[PDB]
Design a protein around this ligand. Structure first.
Ligand SMILES: CO[C@@H]1O[C@H](CO)[C@@H](O[C@@H]2O[C@@H]3CO[C@](C)(C(=O)O)O[C@H]3[C@H](O)[C@@H]2NC(C)=O)[C@H](O)[C@H]1NC(C)=O
Length: 171
């Protein structure tokens, strides 16, 4: 097998993962912003960046925000829609949670969310989290409501990449 560090090294070499901001380091114990995770999804699934389009009203969500082209791409793809469809808030500085990451990866991999799942996930996420656990993207002992650690996101991204390659529909 590969260690989490080796999985990070591989994904970094592939341009999918970056160091914890301010570093080139795995920092496997640290959290990740939804902005950073949008970029991970774009690189992981080979999505096209969308420049000069703004679908959200978050403060400092504009042409000067490095994350906008990635956030627009995952929005167009239907992987993410943000946290509030009235105020159009993505919460790009918010930390990506296990169940949020579960939704994005389940959606990207075309996996069926589990109906009437019984788990500790937020109501909207129960089916997404259940499908992610069933597919081996996260452990059943992961807290769906917790901020995902970079270790959990590296393991999930690596597993998602292996599933995509093995399905014969890799980008
Ligand atoms: C009342 O609490 C709010 O409940 C919302 C809907 O039930 C919840 O919305 C979810 O947000 C998640 C954020 O991450 C992703 C991966 C995304 O698409 O960006 O998934 C989103 C869910 O689909 C859901 N969003 C909506 C608009 O219903 C808010 O996060 C949550 N807001 C906050 C501030 O925590």
């Amino acid at each position: 097998a590969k260690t989490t560090q080796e999985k990070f090294d591989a994904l970094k070499e592939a341009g999918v993962f970056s160091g914890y901001p301010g570093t080139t380091d795995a920092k496997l114990g640290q959290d990740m912003t939804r902005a950073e995770f949008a970029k991970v999804l774009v690189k992981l699934f080979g999505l096209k960046e969308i420049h000069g389009q703004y679908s959200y009203k978050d403060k400092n969500y504009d042409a000067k925000n490095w994350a906008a082209p990635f956030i627009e791409a995952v929005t167009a793809e239907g992987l993410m829609q943000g946290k509030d469809l009235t105020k159009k808030i993505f919460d790009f500085n918010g930390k990506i949670t296990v169940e949020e990451a579960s939704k994005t990866l389940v959606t990207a991999l075309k996996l069926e969310p589990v109906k009437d799942a019984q788990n500790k996930a937020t109501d909207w996420a129960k089916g997404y989290f259940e499908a992610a656990v069933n597919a081996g993207l996260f452990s059943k002992d992961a807290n769906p409501k917790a901020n995902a650690t970079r270790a959990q996101l590296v393991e999930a991204a690596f597993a998602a990449d292996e599933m995509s390659k093995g399905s014969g529909s890799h980008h």
